[PDB]
Design a protein around this ligand. Structure first.
Ligand SMILES: CCCCCCCCCCCCCCCCCC(=O)OC[C@H](COP(=O)([O-])OCC(O)COP(=O)([O-])OC[C@@H](COC(=O)CCCCCCCCCCCCCCCCC)OC(=O)CCCCCCCCCCCCCCCCC)OC(=O)CCCCCCCCCCCCCCCCC
Ligand SMILES: CCCCCCCCCCCCCCCCCC(=O)OC[C@H](COP(=O)([O-])OCC(O)COP(=O)([O-])OC[C@@H](COC(=O)CCCCCCCCCCCCCCCCC)OC(=O)CCCCCCCCCCCCCCCCC)OC(=O)CCCCCCCCCCCCCCCCC
Ligand SMILES: CCCCCCCCCCCCO[C@@H]1O[C@H](CO)[C@@H](O[C@H]2O[C@H](CO)[C@@H](O)[C@H](O)[C@H]2O)[C@H](O)[C@H]1O
Ligand SMILES: CCCCCCCCCCCCO[C@@H]1O[C@H](CO)[C@@H](O[C@H]2O[C@H](CO)[C@@H](O)[C@H](O)[C@H]2O)[C@H](O)[C@H]1O
Ligand SMILES: CCCCCCCCCCCCO[C@@H]1O[C@H](CO)[C@@H](O[C@H]2O[C@H](CO)[C@@H](O)[C@H](O)[C@H]2O)[C@H](O)[C@H]1O
Lengths: 207, 112, 140, 226, 133, 140, 44, 108, 90, 207, 52, 60
């Protein structure tokens, strides 16, 4: 909560309180210390406000994604169906492929499900969209075949798909690491500034 | 009964306020003063005369042009001291234990 | 009247504030652009005297401290912002009188020149046409 | 070691400092209860007022970001306003704690530029309303100074009254609204200045003869005026 | 929530309004013609429950299941019990209060006195005295 | 979007309201005796008004009349370039800065003697308490 | 002559703060002239 | 462990409450305040007669402080107001005679 | 007037008290006592003035403002004073 | 003048350019240097903008005062009449007094001129107004007298007037001195920051 | 139609922008007040964990 | 703002930062001959090539 505004004089003081003698060395040094303190406080405020705003925004984003039941490359969603989770883990980590146990109609259905899921997940700006769609199109072309005969034909596209996939994974990991490092550096700097301000307040003079 | 006072009647409301169980001295409201320029002006005058800051601070005195003192503190001195003793002994006059002194003072001050 | 308009007397407080804000914003933008330019030049030259010299690249007078407008002047027959002392009745003016079997001016009030009001009451305002010898309607 | 033992008699003895505290802490020592001061009257922002303004009843725009929720004056007050003191009256036209449109400048040059262009004054933005006692102290000091300046002046009390009306209308935080109220005493002071000057320097004029119909009716009395 | 002073506001206010109350005393009961009897001089022989309950509640607060309001209440009761004897000592020792203790007066003398003529507030000096003129 | 506006309100004449105009009103016309009076005054050498003289004796400072094409239409204009004076020292005020927050005499005076006195009273009470604590600590 | 920032009716016109402009028109004018009818217009 | 400060702040709150209750027409509340206004302080009780007889610089300091806190002149006929004023002045006098006041902004 | 100066003053007080003794300290160590108290008072004023001014404003306005609701207006000041004391005297 | 906005990509880059490997020690140190540089630039901008705004405002005030022909305690106006200058210098530095050579009417006129000038110069908020007006009122009272007899009576007020006068003069001097000192300190600090930024730019790394 | 009004469909771009600005300003004021309070507490306690 | 069903039509858009409120005016009455009918010369009738002048310089 806030404080009430400070009190003001009722009678008008224009310049009667102005000093009639130039300042002294100690007063000059105290003014310099005050300026240093205000700069330190400005830096601390910047750090604190940035940290607070980012934390709030990101927690809100997390709550929104959890509310709309989203799942990303890091599969950290418990409300998923086992089938959806298997399909997403195949798209992210494994190899999408239709089994020989299924009938041709069920294979077509499975490929359509893969395509729908992946197209809703990846937009046109996403790099992996074209390789994924190409691999699924190769699957559609090679439905009426066995996995052994389908591998030789779809490997050339699955390679690019897996490459883009691993690239995204590495991007995510590097982002986490770099953000941690930057955050820790900023927090350490803020702590050091706080201690410097503490010593300057112990040294400050006036009333 | 107590009707709203528009903003145009506030200057008269300040120097002729409505009646209350604890009213001020309306005849003395124009005499309430507290100068915020006392010490600044004193310092300015002394430094213009030629004194130093230390001499000015030693010669400084508090303002005498403040709200006048209540004459009751000098006229009803003994009765007030007795009432304060009664209060200190009887827990602030709970359940009418200093009515005696309070009524004596009220009569002395009002006279019907 | 045109002189008053130059000083912003006919303008409202909102318009005065907007003009003040516009001046503020223009000045701020000029200052920041000049700072960017000065910093770039002083960085490519590695000299502080260039920053110092950029302090006099743009001072006629100053912006007005306060402004006064026409809408700030009070008006009103009942408004106490215009009443200092009561004006004597032998100096107050009279309202016109009209009374006859055919017409009068007492069944209504048209108001002042500024604060006007409908002379007919609410029930007969939708039938104002019926209380006229001639009626020239609006253009719409 | 507990903090503030002998400092909360209001809490020990159920003494409410105001009807709001009474209603909150359920002391129930106010016979007439409490009519809460709504939030739109407890806080808010400065607004445009004139009907001859297009942005009327809209918050005032500043160079800085400001909450645009406005302070609403009490337009339909209840018949009984038991407390008719200045304390309770001022809340109908201003918020005691001041308006909520104060800036926190990120730098000193922004403050400088705002002031230079006439868009900021701490006297106006970082402040509360003045209490009746403060108003009276200021008025009495000003009156003493004016009397010391010149006792044999006729416009003295007029100047004092315009000062008083400004202080009462809180010109520090509502200068335009207060000038709207005090320009009348300013005008009276102007007139009195001219009158004093013409009495000091003998200035008179040749009056014309009396008009043939000075009296509307013969039986009417012609009251003589200086 | 407000408890109106005039439930029948249009009618009651006119012929039976409410006056400004009088708080100095009840004014509905007789006026005592004698002062209060001097209460017995106290001592520390009456702080038993106060002290023991303050100790108990302070211990329970150091634990953390007591609270602060109870601590304040108990401490203030004990402090009042001590201030009793402190004030008794002051009154019985200091000489300026002996007259106040044996002070007596009657409503008749109160009404006959004439000091009310001098209850007029003074006048603040001139502001020129600041400059010494 | 203000010029050439439409008729926004209706024009009408209420029944039996008078007009006060006869049928020859259009042939009627106004007249003022002022032109003839001026001619007659000029011809008979009657007293002239002082407005015919450009110099103005109605004040102590020099004023000269500016005429708008006729001696009857004039405005006095001052000649002096008035010198103004300020019994004020420079550099003694920084209004943009909030002074109630800074520590010092100027700060306390931008605040008031009441706040300073309250602070001093708190100071005295705190000193009393701390002196009691010092006594009870050093007596051990 | 006491509360200048609060009494704008007694303040100079904005053309006076500008430092730029036989006989010339006055450089300094107040807003209090608005309270007079024949201040600027002539008495013809 | 801070009785002087605590009782000062409490007395100020009670004065404010008395004023508010007077404004709102509440005899019960204002009498509650008057009763709770710390009448059992031996130090202030002992300083009361000293203030009633003081004179000069000490009295001027105390009156300056009391005008800073409560500048409104109480009615010369209300004994409750008179007594609360006397009590506050006696408290300030005790504080001053223990540790004098320094009211000037200029000081070192 | 600074924390360092006040701490040095209190150290001077304590050492002079140890030198004098528990019987003549109050008589022999008055000037140092006053200097230490004045320094601690300047520190307290500088570090708790905002809260004092806030309490003064609340008292002026009868505790009708938002920040005057509850007991924070008083607890903040008392806590500031306690912190200053605990930082100076021990 | 300003530069044109920088160019932007036409095709949408969402995250394809994000790093796939965590940063290194040198890159971290370079980021820290960049932050230090931006803080230095912020401080420099604050100093420069404050200096510029104040200089412009004060030059404008000076031009306005010169345009309206103002004169202050420092009599630095050349368009003054000799009589006005003598009167102002008597009010500021000397002693206002009526001469015995003048007739009583001329003495009254001189005192009225003094009063008008001083009341237009000093407002009610000014401290010296009351002493000045009191001294001039004493002069009015003692017109029909000689200077020798008038001194004994008006000295008690002239003392206070001269005190307030010298106080204002000392205020002005101290203000000038303190402003000079503060300005010089700020400028030195800005220069030091500029040199620090120069060395940090020589040490910076990247492209 | 009432559902649309909840989402601001009948509102104009000016009104949408003003609501957005209002949210921005409320959030900013809350943040700055909280910062002032946190700094005061952390200064009287001389500890960074309070800010945290 | 553009729509006639907006109260602040033909008025500058408000931002959290201070902005010059002088607006870009589209070409409503163009000349008959517009010799250059390329996109370069056409875009200037509805947008400014250099962008709008309402960009912020954030202090933090
Ligand atoms: C603070 C306290 C204050 C308190 C209050 C104090 C008040 C103030 C102080 C008071 C002090 C007291 C003072 C006294 C009171 C003041 C009164 C006053 O001054 O009046 C003001 C007030 C008016 O003041 P105002 O401000 O001007 O009001 C607005 C105007 O009036 C608006 O005008 P309008 O637009 O409504 O138009 C009206 C129109 C109205 O015009 C008409 O009504 C005329 C219609 C005629 C139709 C038929 C005509 C046929 C003739 C044909 C001729 C041959 C052909 C020629 C063709 C061309 C001619 C048609 O014009 C006229 O009025 C014309 C009037 C002039 C002619 C008068 C003719 C008199 C003839 C009398 C005949 C007597 C016969 C006796 C036989 C007995 C039986 C055996 O008085 C009125 O009320 C006005 C109306 C008066 C009524 C007149 C009606 C006459 C009708 C005669 C018909 C005859 C037919 C007979 C048939 C029966 C036999 C078969
Ligand atoms: C029931 C109640 C009984 C008890 C009574 C109680 C009341 C007692 C008290 C008396 C009433 C007092 C009440 C207060 C009055 C205040 C209100 C007021 O008076 O003014 C309101 C009222 C308000 O008007 P306003 O809008 O305010 O304007 C005011 C203006 O100041 C004036 O406006 P304006 O100037 O525009 O109006 C004048 C109008 C009328 O003015 C006149 O005409 C002047 C009067 C002359 C009369 C004599 C000529 C008659 C000719 C007859 C011959 C026709 C052919 C014969 C056919 C026979 C077969 C039918 O002018 C014209 O309209 C155009 C005519 C221009 C020519 C006139 C000069 C030439 C005359 C010769 C004709 C030559 C034609 C040649 C053509 C060119 C060829 C090259 O004023 C008038 O309306 C004025 C005219 C009123 C005429 C009423 C029509 C009825 C007249 C008969 C009345 C009853 C007769 C009784 C029997 C006696 C006759 C047999
Ligand atoms: C000298 C007296 C004898 C001669 C009588 C002259 C004619 C009398 C006039 C008509 C009387 C009725 O008038 C009727 O009531 C009042 C008149 O003010 C008007 O009513 C209007 O003004 C009143 C003000 O009092 C408002 O309260 C009301 O809300 C409004 O509608 C009606 O518009 C009118 O239709
Ligand atoms: C025996 C004495 C003469 C007896 C006859 C008296 C008859 C007087 C009545 C005539 C009408 C007077 O009506 C009015 O009064 C006086 C003159 O009297 C004049 O009044 C005016 O001139 C006279 C000069 O005598 C001035 O004193 C007066 O200040 C001025 O107002 C008016 O110009 C005139 O219009
Ligand atoms: C072709 C032939 C032309 C014939 C010309 C005839 C000329 C006649 C001119 C007479 C003019 C008189 O004019 C009128 O007279 C009277 C007294 O006499 C003046 O005086 C009257 O009014 C004024 C004030 O109103 C006062 O003097 C006084 O109250 C009254 O006596 C009038 O102010 C004046 O308007």
């Amino acid at each position: 909560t806030a404080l009430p505004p400070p009190p003001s004089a009722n009678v008008a003081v224009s310049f009667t309180a102005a000093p009639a003698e130039p300042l002294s060395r100690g007063e000059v040094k105290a003014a310099s210390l005050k300026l240093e303190l205000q700069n330190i406080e400005r830096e601390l405020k910047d750090w604190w406000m940035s940290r607070k705003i980012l934390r709030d925004r990101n927690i809100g984003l997390f709550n929104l994604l959890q509310h709309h039941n989203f799942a990303g490359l890091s599969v950290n969603n418990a409300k998923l169906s086992d089938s959806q989770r298997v399909m997403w883990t195949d798209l992210v980590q494994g190899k999408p492929d239709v089994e020989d146990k299924l009938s041709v109609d069920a294979r077509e259905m499975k490929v359509d499900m893969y395509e729908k899921l992946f197209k809703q997940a990846a937009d046109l700006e996403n790099p992996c969209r074209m390789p994924g769609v190409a691999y699924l199109r190769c699957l559609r072309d090679t439905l009426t075949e066995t996995q052994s005969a389908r591998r030789s034909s779809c490997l050339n596209a699955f390679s690019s798909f897996d490459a883009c996939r691993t690239g995204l994974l590495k991007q995510q990991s590097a982002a986490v690491e770099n953000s941690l490092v930057r955050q820790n550096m900023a927090d350490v700097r803020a702590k050091a500034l706080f201690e410097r301000r503490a010593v300057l307040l112990d040294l400050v003079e006036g009333k | 009964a107590a009707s709203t006072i528009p903003i145009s009647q506030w200057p008269s409301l300040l120097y002729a306020p409505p009646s209350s169980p604890a009213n001020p001295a309306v005849e003395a409201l124009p005499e309430m003063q507290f100068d915020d320029l006392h010490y600044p002006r004193q310092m300015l005058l002394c430094r213009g005369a030629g004194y130093s800051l230390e001499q000015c601070n030693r010669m400084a005195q508090p303002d005498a042009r403040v709200t006048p003192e209540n004459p009751a503190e000098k006229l009803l001195k003994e009765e007030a001291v007795a009432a304060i003793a009664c209060l200190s002994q009887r827990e602030g006059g709970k359940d009418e234990q200093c009515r005696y002194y309070i009524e004596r003072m009220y009569k002395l001050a009002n006279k019907e | 009247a045109q002189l008053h308009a130059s000083e912003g007397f006919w303008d409202s407080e909102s318009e005065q504030q907007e003009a003040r804000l516009q001046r503020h914003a223009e000045h701020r933008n000029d200052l920041e652009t000049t700072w960017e330019e000065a910093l770039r030049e002083a960085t490519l030259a590695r000299n502080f005297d260039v920053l110092v010299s950029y302090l006099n690249h743009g001072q006629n007078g100053i912006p007005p401290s306060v402004t006064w407008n026409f809408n700030a002047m009070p008006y009103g027959k009942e408004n106490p912002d215009t009443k200092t002392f009561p004006i004597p009745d032998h100096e107050q003016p009279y309202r016109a009188f009209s009374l006859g079997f055919t017409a009068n001016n007492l069944s209504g009030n048209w108001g002042d020149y500024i604060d006007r009001q409908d002379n007919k009451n609410a029930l007969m305002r939708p039938a104002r046409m019926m209380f006229t010898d001639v009626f020239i309607p609006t253009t719409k | 070691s507990i903090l503030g033992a002998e400092a909360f008699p209001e809490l020990l003895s159920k003494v409410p400092l105001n009807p709001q505290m009474d209603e909150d802490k359920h002391f129930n020592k106010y016979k007439w209860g409490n009519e809460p001061i709504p939030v739109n009257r407890r806080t808010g922002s400065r607004m445009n007022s004139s009907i001859y303004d297009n942005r009327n009843h809209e918050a005032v725009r500043h160079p800085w970001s400001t909450d645009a929720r406005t302070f609403h004056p009490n337009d339909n007050p209840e018949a009984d306003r038991i407390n008719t003191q200045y304390s309770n009256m001022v809340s109908d036209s201003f918020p005691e704690g001041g308006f909520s449109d104060a800036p926190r400048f990120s730098s000193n040059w922004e403050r400088l530029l705002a002031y230079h262009h006439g868009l900021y004054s701490p006297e106006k933005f970082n402040s509360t309303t003045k209490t009746a006692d403060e108003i009276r102290l200021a008025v009495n000091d000003f009156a003493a100074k004016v009397h010391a300046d010149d006792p044999k002046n006729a416009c003295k009390y007029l100047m004092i009254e315009e000062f008083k009306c400004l202080q009462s209308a809180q010109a520090r935080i509502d200068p335009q609204g207060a000038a709207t109220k005090c320009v009348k005493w300013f005008n009276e002071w102007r007139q009195c200045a001219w009158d004093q000057e013409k009495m000091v320097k003998g200035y008179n004029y040749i009056e014309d003869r009396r008009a043939r119909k000075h009296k509307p009716y013969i039986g009417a009395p012609d009251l003589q005026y200086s | 929530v407000r408890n109106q002073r005039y439930p029948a506001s249009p009618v009651q206010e006119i012929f039976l309004p409410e006056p400004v109350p009088f708080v100095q005393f009840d004014q509905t009961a007789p006026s005592p013609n004698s002062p209060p009897a001097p209460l017995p001089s106290p001592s520390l022989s009456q702080c038993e429950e106060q002290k023991d309950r303050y100790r108990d509640i302070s211990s329970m607060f150091h634990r953390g299941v007591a609270g602060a309001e109870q601590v304040r209440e108990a401490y203030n009761s004990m402090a009042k019990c001590f201030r009793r004897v402190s004030v008794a000592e002051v009154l019985e020792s200091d000489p300026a209060f002996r007259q106040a203790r044996n002070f007596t007066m009657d409503l008749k003398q109160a009404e006959d006195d004439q000091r009310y003529k001098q209850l007029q507030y003074g006048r603040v000096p001139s502001i020129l005295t600041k400059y010494h003129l | 979007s203000m010029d050439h506006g439409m008729q926004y309100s209706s024009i009408y004449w209420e029944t039996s309201h008078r007009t006060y105009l006869p049928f020859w009103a259009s042939l009627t016309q106004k007249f003022s005796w002022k032109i003839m009076d001026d001619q007659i005054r000029s011809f008979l050498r009657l007293p002239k008004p002082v407005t015919t003289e450009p110099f103005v004796f109605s004040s102590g400072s020099p004023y000269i009349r500016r005429y708008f094409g006729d001696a009857d239409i004039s405005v006095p204009v001052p000649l002096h370039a008035p010198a103004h004076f300020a019994f004020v020292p420079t550099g003694t005020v920084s209004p943009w800065e909030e002074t109630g927050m800074e520590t010092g005499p100027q700060g306390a005076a931008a605040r008031g003697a009441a706040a300073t006195a309250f602070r001093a009273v708190l100071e005295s009470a705190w000193k009393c308490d701390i002196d009691e604590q010092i006594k009870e600590k050093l007596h051990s | 002559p006491f509360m200048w920032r609060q009494r704008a009716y007694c303040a100079p016109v904005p053309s006076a703060f500008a430092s730029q402009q036989g006989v010339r028109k006055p450089l300094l004018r107040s807003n209090s002239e608005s309270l007079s009818v024949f201040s600027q217009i002539p008495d013809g | 462990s801070s009785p002087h400060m605590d009782r000062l702040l409490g007395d100020l709150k009670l004065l404010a409450a008395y004023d508010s209750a007077a404004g709102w027409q509440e005899p019960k509340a204002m009498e509650s305040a008057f009763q709770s206004l710390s009448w059992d302080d031996a130090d202030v009780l002992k300083a009361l007669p000293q203030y009633l007889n003081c004179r000069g610089e000490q009295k001027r300091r105390v009156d300056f402080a009391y005008a800073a806190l409560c500048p409104r002149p109480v009615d010369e006929k209300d004994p409750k107001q008179t007594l609360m004023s006397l009590w506050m002045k006696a408290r300030l006098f005790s504080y001053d005679q223990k540790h004098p006041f320094v009211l000037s902004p200029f000081a070192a | 007037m600074s924390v360092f100066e006040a701490r040095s003053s209190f150290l001077d007080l304590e050492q002079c008290a140890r030198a004098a003794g528990p019987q003549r300290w109050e008589a022999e160590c008055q000037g140092v006592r006053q200097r230490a108290l004045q320094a601690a008072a300047d520190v307290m004023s500088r570090e708790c003035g905002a809260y004092g001014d806030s309490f003064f404003q609340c008292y002026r306005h009868g505790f009708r403002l938002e920040a005057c609701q509850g007991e924070k207006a008083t607890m903040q000041l008392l806590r500031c004073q306690r912190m200053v004391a605990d930082r100076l005297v021990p």
